[PDB]
């Protein structure tokens, strides 16, 4: 997926992922929400995209209350048969404000 710089950006920001396997580390990332895709890159500088995801087909959901993955704030994207997004906000604004952008492209 290749992002269009001339493209309005409907949010953007750190989040923290959790790694797919290992020692299950959360590796902080640049996030940009533009059009109905999620890019992440390394820093705030947007420059290499270090991923992507085409998220109409994603379903996008807050793990709820309690830091029941071991840090506060946490959402979870997942879609069978696709890769799982494990996500962290860093204050209830912050997730808030990306549950709802999110929300929007998905749908
Ligand atoms: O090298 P180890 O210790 O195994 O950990 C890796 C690196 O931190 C990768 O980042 P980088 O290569 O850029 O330093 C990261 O990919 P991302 O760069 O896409 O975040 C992986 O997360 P996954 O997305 O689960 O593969 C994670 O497993």
Redesign the pocket.
């Known amino acids: 997926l290749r992002r269009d710089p001339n493209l309005p950006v409907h949010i953007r920001g750190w989040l923290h ?1 959790q ?2 396997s ?1 020692l299950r580390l959360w ?1 902080r ?1 640049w996030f940009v929400l533009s059009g109905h895709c999620l890019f992440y890159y390394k820093d705030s500088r947007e420059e290499s995209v ?2 992507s995801v085409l998220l109409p087909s994603y379903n996008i959901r807050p793990d709820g209350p309690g830091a029941p993955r071991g840090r506060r704030f946490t959402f979870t994207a997942e879609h069978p048969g696709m890769r799982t997004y494990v996500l962290a906000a860093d204050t209830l604004e912050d997730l808030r404000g990306w549950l709802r952008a999110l929300g929007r492209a998905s749908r």
Do not use: E
């Open positions: 992922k790694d797919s290992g590796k990332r270090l991923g």
